[PDB]
């Protein structure tokens, strides 16, 4: 999961 | 062996600074030093009062310094006293709740968000009666507050940003100034970040790295006449502080002085100060991991980088004789175990025999290992690296042999047949270099003939492969049993329980063993033939659900089920997922429960011993045949022993390696890493505490000049976190009694959204708090402290309203009331938008792009989406990843209606916004928040109002932690917007209309951002 | 309300969105709690439902709940002192295992509202010696005194308040294919929550429908 | 089994004829099954140069709005990883040109 | 718990106990706790009625009998010295109390 | 009422169960609410008690009336200088020594 | 509010002693004082080595100071 | 549910  | 000095403050000849988490004082005159305060926890900031007598100190507590509060120090009598009981939330990057400065009268002004809905609202407060009362300055969020010639000087977001050098985003530190006893003007707004401002004479001295490195500068009280004073090159300067004459600061671990007049920089001499016991004792359970069952009913587990072979009891323990960093331990024989040892160079396979002692460690590098296993006959091992390769390592020679390499993700899910002939594993794939999803097909590798076969097709997600004892059929799970489950709030459907087990007989002609096909009616006993085996695949008659493991047994099958549940706790608190071990009897086709409250499970190689961890954190072990007979696995019997300096070096190198290995751009990585290594490695030996290491590590992470380089977790102290008693209220000292200045409440009928006093049918606002649990609070009794001492319990509170109205209720003293304040705010803004738009505009606010965001968006989206206009306030948005999902919603356009015989129209689509939309955004919205903002404009859903946003669109997905539990993050996923490239990173998003929120706007109690938005929509809604 | 003696029906309230089929009557025959479907606009995409309570004495309607979600299954306790009901307000997303999406699967939770201001949540087990109930009926702004009952979120369809326990009808998450094409009934299970022990248990499973005596 | 056979046949057909540059998806109805079939292939066919959303013989239902909302997504960015392939944004975005097939048996 | 002592069961399933010289009326859970409003040195706490508890308060002068009602609040403390009390009890009808001192007297 | 039983087990914990259904016992928790006090108020209290017991229990009442009355104030003035339990110990032990007898210990 | 000083040791102008369980050092010359060691538990004896450089300290631990080491 |  590519949290930002 | 010198220390790491830092964050100093000056006053005359005396100079206070931090060393080893404790506060020290140094006298230039005599040249002596002494520790003036200690054992309070971790201290990072100390400020001299005007008279130079007392000192305000900010100290952190909690294993990860997740909490903080302020203390006073009287150098006259040596008195120490806690001032605030806010238990402010803080992280490495945002250490909120600190000293803002001192007013002309010599009073302390603090900056905290304790009573605010958003962490970034670090509003200013004046401290009175040593923490008794708090008077707000209503100047908006601030980090520093200075005074000059009767003029307030406000520093916004002016704290240091070591983790992001060269930051030029919208949240960059800026300085404002008063000009008309209430009017404010922004005076320092450079392209880069401005930190730690001070005023000597009539010039503001601060720090910035506009020239490519941190240096000191200054400008008149008008932001004019810029001047570059220092010219450092070794380490960025930090924490500027003055007394009116000279400026003090720290650099590379030393304390320096700068004289504004002479303009001379000089280093203060301090030498050695403290060198604590290097040999430390730790608790294995606190850092344990990788627990595995061995033969003879033994156990293997890893902790703080060390490995052990012990009995369930934990009485007989053996440490594996290997230097630091053992990543994995795996049963490799009767008395032999295989392990994975990691070094700065990489990961290597090893083997140890806890009986004899022989521990021949290999040297063939395997890259970054994330999965390891050994066959049941200790011949070879299977390994998965971050190169996306799966390989077999000869446990005798050491020669690794790559079997297959995926180009999408790691091959961590694999199993070996009991006869050591086949290797089944999940192979992540894509049918296009840009597909939105990644499929996974089970692959089977044959040691004989050395050839790979397709056990499954590549159209979904097939996993958890597992062979049966006799190695005749391959079992596995897949999410192919599609069947939608309805959403109870939003018109939507999701695949909740679509998991089901399947089997594949390795011998063509043989039927599904679970089908119970009479032997007399079949003719098995053919011969292995893995060709087109995916065609012979068959399911096993078990209701669809959410399975994570399948274990084939003699006449039954064990299945690990995970009941549907929310993901809030898991997303924010990292809370483990809850499963339950189920059993399916092939004969009776009936299912039963073997063990519940499981959060993890491991199974022996012999399939006779089960090891599991329950929701209580403990580890248990029980025989599969008699699951009722479980024992608790104890490990805290033998103290864990290590050396601070050996561990600190190890930890630095790993942090340095991950940062390099995970940076999104490999090229930039090779250069930055090689250029910052030694420079920061030389500071490690000066570190004595986890906090010292943090300073070094964070500064080195900042060398990548990118967003998302964070440092979370880790053990920094044995002090318990600070407690704060809350009842969702605001107190004010009026005379000798505290009055309920405000009683927060959002949606009365929702859960946890109002002051617990409301349950007694009375709005506390206005009432006078007499006493709590017998003790009288007021003028001479800190209510904040009393409440703190009752946090998490129920106390009797005597109240008093208008007339002779007196209440005496048992109130629940909560540990926190942030959410209640957030919901209160949202509802207030919502009510506001309705009244001002004469009931023609809706309101929705998105706190972040995570589970909570998703929650809040839909919580109001269902009542506000059908107004003439909509305001999608996304200010303070903390990022996440679900922006795309929210946009997809707003993207819907109403193109029809349903006319019923009875009732009202039904808009099509349902999730369509009725009219004009408008977004509000500030500098406190970033990451996914950044993406959402750019997208909103890019797709033309409406106008964007506010201020440039944060600017950090390089995502992360940590997958490895430090031996002390520390979880470091590395910008690994650079976002590329079409027709803009990576432009958003280190910049943010520009709103179509810029509406600043000056300090004077806060003083007038007006929100210029939400007002403009409303007024602007009314204009568009004239058509 | 139709007078079972004369036959004269008397309209209490009329919704303009959907039927008011979910209602309950207090044991003392004084209050009538029911789900009132509403909208905040003649074109809203969703229909909210707020529980309303009607008092036979004074003949006046009160708002037991706010109009921001779906509140249902109202039910009074024997002594007719508190009103219990369920609501889909416990928002918390559940991940989709195939498609990048999230859905509100288990966001159902029970709540209670004492009809006498000052009285606490009966399930909170607040010592009588430490409270001063015995006030008097006052349904005004009762939606402010609302309080939840400490029971894990799920998919509840009924709540029955008993002496020292509460019965709850749970419906485990499941697909809708069979129900959509075969009209297949939904599967539930009768659960019991002991106020004292705060522990839950199963009373009866494989239920597809349930009715309870007066 | 015959329906799935047909869909897969048409799917294999569309690949071969478009030299592997076009995707295929078929929606039998706008009910639960439709939702099932649409996503069953939507996850493997949405990232081709072109997409064919065959909705012939569609028996109706009510979830059309949900499927449209999906196809309505336009690809406007990507995620560049240190290792692995690009991640399209949004994820449920069709990569290129779309084309629908419909007969008199869809209502 | 580190300084607790004199744990005693009351009515309504309540508990009374002394610690570090302080007294408390709480539920088994320890969630609802009330401190007896009395200065330092409470030697003993004893059930003396539905919501009333009798206590023994000690000072430099000696030990004195007291009474507290955790419901209302009335806490009238006596002044008649009893010497050094080592045992205290109350009848079931809250009329009187029995006390034993180091003078070897029962009263 | 003879209906409630309260007990402590060899594990130090306190439990409570109905006499009719002794199988239904709960654990009495008390460490939920922090215990609050003042070092200087407690230290004075403790000194006076130590000073009183020393006087009240000395084998010879006569010698007691004199030694006590002659050492009280002298050692009481040191209590306010004490900040730690160890500081108090020093004061108390020295005052116990004023009885010039054996067996005056502090454990 | 002064402290309770006790168990001192001397060496030249420097003078170590115990205050608040911790060890302190005082310089008759300058007249200043400082805590040279703390957080080790309860200290009751500190002795100057011959050279006056190092110091041997006896510290007690355990709830009732039932244990000790140097 | 408004089937069509
Ligand atoms: C073994 C690698 C673990 C990776 C951490 C979580 C990755 C999830 C992708 C959303
Ligand atoms: C009592 C009315 C029953 C209505 C049949 C199903 C209606 C569902 C709306 C989707």
- How far apart are alpha carbons B289 and B308 in whole angstroms? 11
On whether the CB atoms of residues B194 and B207 are closer than 8 A, the answer is: yes
Contact of B712 with B969, CB cutoff 8 Å: yes
Positions of E strands within C39-133: 48-55, 60-63, 71-76, 82-87, 94-95, 102-103, 109-114
Q: Would you list the DSSP string of C144-160?
A: GT-EE-S---B-EEEEE
Strands B288-293 and B775-776, bridge-based pairing: unpaired
Where does residue F76 rank: exposed (0-12), middle (13-18), buried (19+ CB within 10 A)? Answer: middle
Place of tokens 């600043």: B996
Q: Please give, one letter per residue, the 3-state secondary structure of B990-1019.
A: CCCEECCCCHHHHHCCCCHHHHHHHHHHHH
Question: The tokens of B24 are what?
Answer: 């020290």
What one-character DSSP code corresponds to residue F62? H
The four Cα atoms B792, B795, B798, B802 give a dihedral, to 10 degrees, of: 40
Say if residues G50 and G56 touch (Cβ distance below 8 Å): no
- How many Cβ atoms from other residues are within 10 Å of residue F26's Cβ? 15
CA distance B15 to B1018: 58
Report the DSSP pairing between strands B326-331 and B317-319. Answer: unpaired
Separation CA B792–CA B771 (nearest Å): 18
Is B965 in contact with B714 (CB distance < 8 Å)? yes
Distance (Å, whole) CA B165 – CA B193: 9
- Residue G34: Cβ-neighbour burial (10 angstroms; 0-12, 13-18, 19+): middle
Asked if residue E47 lies in contact with residue E19, where contact means CB atoms within 8 angstroms, the answer is no
Domains (range + CATH), chain C: 1-214 (2.130.10.10)
* 8 A C-beta contact, residue B1009 and residue B922: yes
Beta bridge partners of C182: none
Indicate if the alpha-carbon torsion angle B315, B316, B322, B325 is positive or negative.
negative
Q: Do B790 and F32 touch (CB under 8 A)?
A: no
The CA-based angle B172-B178-B183, given to 5 degrees, is 105
For residue B344, whether the previous peptide bond is cis, meaning omega lies within 30 degrees of 0, is: no
Distance CA B644, CA B304 (A): 12
Task: Name which residue sits closest to atom 4 of ligand 1, judged by CA.
Answer: B959
Distance, in Å, from the CA atom of B135 to the CA atom of C100, rounded to the nearest integer, reads: 48
Shortest CA distance to B1020 belongs to which of B851, B908, B874, B870? B870
Instruction: Give whole-number Cα distances, B592 to B552, B557, B585, B589, B998, in Å.
Output: 15, 11, 9, 10, 64
- What CA–CA distance (Å, rounded) separates H4 from G68? 86
Contact status of B927 with chain A (Cβ, < 8 Å): yes
The answer for B367, left when phi > 0, alpha when psi is -120 to 50, beta otherwise, is left
Instruction: Give residues with Cβ within 8 angstroms of C183, minimum separation 6.
Output: none
Tell me the two tokens of residue B179. 């000009």
Neighbour tally for E1: CB within 10 Å:
14
Structure-block tokens of residue B99: 């000293």
Query: Is the Cα torsion angle B800, B801, B807, B813 positive or negative in sign?
Result: negative
**CB–CB of D71/B436 below 8 Å?**
no
Q: Residue E74: count other Cβ atoms within 10 Å of its Cβ.
A: 9
* CA-CA-CA-CA torsion sign (B282, B285, B286, B290): positive
**Cis peptide, bond prior to residue C192, ω within 30 of zero:** no
Q: Residue with structure tokens 């539930």?
A: C188
Cα–Cα distance measured from residue B911 to residue B889, given in angstroms and rounded to the nearest whole number:
6
Interface test with F, best of E21, E57, E61 (most F CBs within 10 A): E21
Q: Are B367 and B378 in contact (CB under 8 A)?
A: no
Instruction: Write out chain F residues lying below 8 Å of B789, CB-based.
Output: 33-34, 36
Give the separation between CA G34 and CA G23, rounded to whole angstroms.
9
Instruction: Assess G54–B contact: CB distance below 8 Å, yes or no.
Output: no
Distance CA E104, CA F4 (A): 31
Supply B723's token pair. 């407690």
Q: What crossing angle do the helices spanning D2-17 and D32-45 adopt, rounded to 10°? A: 30
Alpha-carbon gap, residue C160 to C152, rounded angstroms: 16
| H/E run at residue F73 | helix F61-76
Cα separation, E76 vs C120, in Å, equals 30
In ligand 1, the atom with minimum distance to the C-alpha of B371 is: 1
The answer to whether B249 and B264 are in contact (CB under 8 A) is: no
Q: Which of D62, D63, D67 to mutate to test the interface with H (most CBs of H within 10 A)?
A: D62
Give the residue from B615, B551, B613 showing the smallest Cα distance to B583: B551
Angle of helix F39-57 relative to helix F61-76, nearest 10 degrees, comes to 160
What's the CA gap between B309 and B320, in Å, rounded? 8
Q: How far apart are CA B842 and CA B844, in angstroms?
A: 7
Question: What secondary structure letter does DSSP report for G62?
Answer: S
Residue G53's CB: how many other CB atoms inside 10 A?
Answer: 8
Q: How far is it, in rounded angstroms, from Cα B562 to Cα B168?
A: 45
Q: How many CB atoms lie within 10 A of CB C29?
A: 9
Please answer yes or no on whether D31 and C175 come within 8 Å at the CB atom: no
Q: With contact defined as beta carbons under 8 Å apart, do B510 and B491 qualify?
A: no
Tokens 């944004």 sit on residue: D89
Specify the pairing of strand B247-251 against strand B237-242.
antiparallel
Strand partners, E28: none
Contact B127, B107 (CB under 8 A): yes
Segment holding E8, helix H or strand E: strand E4-9
B240: phi then psi, degrees, rounded to nearest 5: -70, 140
- Ligand 1 centre and the CA of B621: distance in Å? 27
Distance from CA of H3 to the nearest CA of D (A): 5
- Conformation bin of residue B233: beta by default, left when phi > 0, alpha when psi is -120 to 50: alpha
Neighbors of chain E by Cβ distance (3+ pairs < 8 Å): B, C, F
**Residues of B annotated as binding site for substrate?**
878-880, 955-957
Q: Give the pair of three-digit tokens for residue F19.
A: 């006499």
Rounded Cα–Cα distance for residues B501 and B583 (Å): 13
End-to-end CA distance of chain A: 10
Contact E23, E35 (CB under 8 A): yes
Measure Cα distances from B96 to B17, B111, B119, B159, B174 in Å.
Answer: 19, 7, 8, 9, 17
Q: Helix (H, G, I), strand (E, B), or coil: what is residue G27? A: strand
User: H or E element: which one contains B199?
Assistant: strand B195-200
Tell me the sheet residues that pair with B597: none
Rounded distance, CA D64 to CA B895, Å? 13
CA distance B328 to B284: 16
Q: Which ligand is nearest to the CA of B491?
A: 2
3-state secondary structure chain D: CHHHHHHHHHHHHHHHHCCCCEEEEECCCECHHHHHHHHHHHHHHCCCCEEEEECCCCCCECCHHHHHHHHCCECCEEEEECCCCCEEECCCCECCEEEEECCCCCC
Is there a contact between B846 and B877 (Cβ–Cβ < 8 Å)? Answer: yes
Describe the strand order of the beta sheet including B916-921 as a list of residue ranges. Answer: B841-845, B869-873, B916-921, B942-946, B993-994
Tell me the CA distances in angstroms from B764 to B727, B729, B754, B800, one per residue in order: 10, 8, 11, 9
Q: Which residues of E touch C127 (CB under 8 A)?
A: 12, 14, 27, 32
Both tokens of B352, joined, read 């140890």
Work out which ligand 1 atom sits closest to the CA atom of B958: 5
Contact at CB, C153 and B867, closer than 8 angstroms: no
E32: β partners: B794
- Helices (DSSP H) in B288-387: which residue ranges? none
Find the distance separating the first CA and the last CA of chain D, reported in whole Å. Answer: 23
Neighbours of B34 (CB within 10 A): 16
State the DSSP H helix or E strand holding residue C177, giving kind and residue range, or none if neither: helix C177-181
Helix (H, G, I), strand (E, B) or coil at B493: strand
**How many other CB atoms are found less than 10 A from the CB of residue B781?**
15
What is the SS3 assignment for B468? coil
Residue B413 · residue B404 · CB < 8 Å: no
What angle separates helix B644-662 from helix B666-681, to the nearest 10 degrees?
Answer: 160
Sheet strands side by side (includes B22-27): B6-11, B14-19, B22-27, B32-37
What is d(CA B1013, CA B1007) in angstroms, rounded to the nearest whole number?
10
For ligand 1, what atom is nearest to the CA of residue A1?
A: 10
Does residue B258 sit in helix, strand or coil?
Answer: strand
Distance CA F77, CA F44 (A): 10
Contact (Cβ atoms closer than 8 angstroms) between residue B744 and residue B752: no
Q: By the 8 A CB rule, do B435 and D89 touch? A: no
In which region does residue E85 sit, left (phi positive, over 0), alpha (psi from -120 to 50) or beta (all else)? beta
- Strand ranges for G3-66 from DSSP E: 6-11, 14-19, 22-27, 32-37, 42-48, 55-61
Name the DSSP letter for residue C68: S
Classify strands B993-994 and B942-946 as parallel, antiparallel or unpaired. parallel
b/e per residue E23-52 (b: at least 16 CB within 10 A)? bbbbbbbbbbbbbbbbebbbbbbbbbbebb
Q: How far is CA B932 from CA B602, B826, C6, in A?
A: 41, 20, 64
Q: Determine contact, residues B10/B243, Cβ cutoff 8 Å.
A: yes
Answer yes or no: are the C-beta atoms of D95 and D47 closer than 8 Å: yes
| Whether the Cβ atoms of residue G57 and residue G40 lie closer than 8 Å to each other | yes
CA-nearest of B106, B123, B103, B105 to B115 is B123
A1 contacts in B (CB within 8 Å)?
Answer: 881, 957
Resolution value (Å, 1 decimal) = 2.8
The first and second tokens of residue G34, run together, are 């400082």
Cβ-based neighbours of B925, under 8 Å, separated by 6 or more? B874, B875, B876, B877, B878, B879, B932, B933, B949, B950
Among left, alpha and beta (phi > 0; psi -120 to 50; other), residue B97 is left
Closest by alpha carbon to B568, among B825, B853, B815, B960? B853
Residues 6+ positions from C211 with CB-CB distance below 8 Å: none
**Any B CB within 8 A of D15 CB:** no
Would you give the DSSP letter of residue B95? Answer: -
Q: How far is CA C42 from CA B867, B905, B914, E60, in A?
A: 10, 7, 11, 79
């Amino acid at each position: 999961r590519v949290r930002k | 062996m010198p220390n790491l000095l830092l964050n100093p403050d000056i006053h005359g000849d005396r100079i206070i600074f931090v060393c080893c988490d404790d506060l020290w004082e140094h006298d230039l005159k005599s040249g002596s030093t002494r520790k003036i305060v200690s054992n309070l926890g971790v201290i990072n900031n100390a400020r001299f009062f005007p008279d130079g007598r007392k000192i305000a100190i900010r100290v952190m507590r909690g294993s990860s310094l997740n909490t903080a509060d302020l203390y006073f120090y009287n150098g006259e009598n040596g008195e120490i006293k806690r001032i605030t009981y806010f238990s402010g939330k803080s992280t490495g990057r945002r250490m909120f709740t600190d000293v803002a400065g001192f007013d002309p009268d010599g009073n302390l002004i603090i900056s905290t968000d304790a009573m605010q809905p958003f962490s970034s609202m670090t509003c200013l407060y004046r401290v009175e009666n040593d923490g008794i009362n708090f008077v707000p300055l209503n100047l908006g969020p601030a980090t520093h507050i200075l005074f000059a010639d009767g003029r307030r000087v406000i520093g916004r977001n002016t704290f240091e940003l070591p983790h992001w050098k060269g930051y030029r985003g919208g949240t960059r530190g800026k300085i404002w100034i008063e000009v008309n006893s209430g009017a404010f003007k922004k005076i320092v707004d450079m392209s880069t970040h401005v930190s730690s401002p001070v005023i000597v004479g009539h010039r503001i001295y601060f720090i910035t790295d506009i020239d490519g490195f941190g240096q000191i500068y200054s400008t008149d009280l008008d932001g004019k006449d810029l001047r570059k004073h220092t010219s450092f090159t070794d380490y960025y300067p930090r924490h500027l502080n003055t007394d009116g004459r000279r400026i003090l600061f720290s650099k590379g671990g030393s304390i320096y002085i700068f004289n504004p007049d002479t303009e001379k920089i000089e280093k203060i001499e301090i030498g050695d100060l403290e060198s604590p016991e290097d040999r430390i004792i730790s608790i294995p359970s606190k850092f344990a991991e990788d627990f595995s069952p061995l033969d003879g009913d033994l156990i293997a587990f890893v902790s703080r980088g060390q490995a052990f072979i012990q009995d369930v009891s934990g009485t007989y323990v053996l440490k594996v004789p290997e230097p630091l960093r053992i990543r994995y331990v795996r049963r490799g024989g009767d008395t032999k175990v295989a392990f994975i040892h990691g070094t700065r160079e990489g990961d290597f396979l090893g083997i140890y025999d806890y009986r004899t002692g022989k521990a021949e460690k290999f040297e063939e590098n395997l890259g970054n290992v994330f999965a390891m296993g050994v066959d049941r006959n200790g011949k070879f091992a299977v390994v998965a690296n971050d190169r996306f390769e799966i390989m077999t390592v000869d446990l005798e020679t050491g020669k690794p042999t790559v079997i297959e390499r995926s180009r999408e993700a790691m091959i961590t899910d694999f199993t070996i047949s009991d006869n050591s002939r086949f290797i089944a594993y999940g192979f992540p794939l894509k049918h296009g270099e840009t597909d939105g999803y990644v499929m996974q097909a089970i692959h089977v590798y044959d040691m004989e003939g050395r050839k790979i076969f397709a056990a499954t097709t590549e159209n979904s997600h097939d996993y958890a492969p597992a062979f049966d004892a006799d190695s005749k059929n391959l079992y596995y799970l897949s999410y192919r049993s599609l069947d939608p489950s309805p959403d109870r709030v939003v018109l939507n459907f999701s695949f909740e329980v679509v998991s089901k087990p399947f089997v594949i007989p390795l011998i063509p002609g043989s039927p599904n063993p679970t089908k119970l096909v009479p032997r007399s009616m079949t003719s098995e006993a053919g011969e292995y033939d893995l060709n087109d085996m995916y065609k012979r695949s068959s399911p096993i008659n078990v209701d669809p659900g959410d399975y994570r493991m399948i274990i084939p047994l003699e006449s039954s099958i064990l299945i690990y089920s995970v009941p549907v549940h929310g993901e809030f706790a898991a997303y924010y608190q990292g809370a483990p997922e809850k499963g339950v071990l189920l059993k399916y009897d092939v004969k009776t086709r009936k299912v039963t429960e073997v063990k519940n409250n499981l959060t993890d499970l491991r199974l022996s190689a012999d399939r006779k011993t089960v090891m599991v961890r329950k929701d209580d954190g403990k580890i248990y072990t029980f025989p599969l045949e008699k699951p009722e007979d479980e024992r608790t696995v104890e490990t805290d019997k033998r103290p864990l022993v290590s050396s601070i300096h050996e561990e600190f070096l190890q930890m630095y190198d790993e942090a340095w390696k991950l940062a390099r290995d995970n940076y999104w751009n490999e090229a930039v990585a090779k250069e930055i890493s090689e250029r910052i290594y030694e420079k920061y490695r030389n500071l490690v030996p000066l570190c004595k505490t986890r906090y010292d290491l943090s300073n070094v590590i964070v500064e080195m992470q900042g060398e990548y000049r990118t967003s998302h380089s964070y440092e979370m977790g880790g053990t920094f102290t044995d002090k318990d976190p600070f407690r704060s008693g809350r009842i969702a209220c605001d107190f004010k000292l009026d005379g000798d009694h505290y009055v309920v200045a405000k009683a927060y409440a959002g949606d009365y009928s929702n859960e946890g959204e109002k002051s617990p006093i409301f349950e007694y049918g009375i709005d506390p606002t206005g009432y006078l708090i007499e006493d709590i649990d017998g003790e009288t609070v007021g003028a001479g009794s800190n209510i904040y402290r009393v409440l703190s001492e009752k946090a998490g319990t129920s106390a009797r509170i005597r109240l008093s309203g208008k007339g002779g109205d007196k209440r005496d209720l048992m109130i629940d003293i909560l540990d926190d009331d942030r959410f209640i304040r957030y919901r209160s705010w949202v509802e207030a803004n919502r009510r506001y938008v309705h009244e001002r738009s004469k009931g023609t505009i809706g309101y929705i606010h998105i706190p972040d792009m995570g589970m909570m965001g998703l929650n809040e968006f839909y919580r109001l989206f269902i009542n506000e989406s059908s107004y003439q206009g909509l305001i999608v306030d996304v200010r303070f948005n903390g990022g996440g990843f679900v922006s795309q999902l929210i946009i997809e919603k707003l993207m819907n356009k109403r193109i029809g209606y349903d006319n019923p015989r009875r009732g009202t129209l039904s808009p099509y689509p349902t999730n369509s916004v009725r009219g004009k939309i408008i977004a509000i955004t500030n500098e406190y919205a970033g990451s996914d928040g950044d993406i959402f903002s750019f997208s909103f404009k890019k797709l033309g859903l409406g106008k964007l109002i506010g201020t440039r946003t944060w600017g950090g669109v390089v995502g992360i997905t940590p997958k490895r932690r430090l031996i002390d539990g520390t979880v470091l993050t590395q910008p690994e996923f650079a976002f590329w917007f079409r027709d803009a490239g990576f432009g958003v990173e280190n910049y943010g998003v520009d709103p179509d209309v810029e509406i600043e929120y000056a300090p004077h706007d806060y003083l007038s109690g007006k929100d210029p951002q939400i007002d403009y938005a409303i007024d602007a929509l009314i204009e568009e809604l004239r058509n």
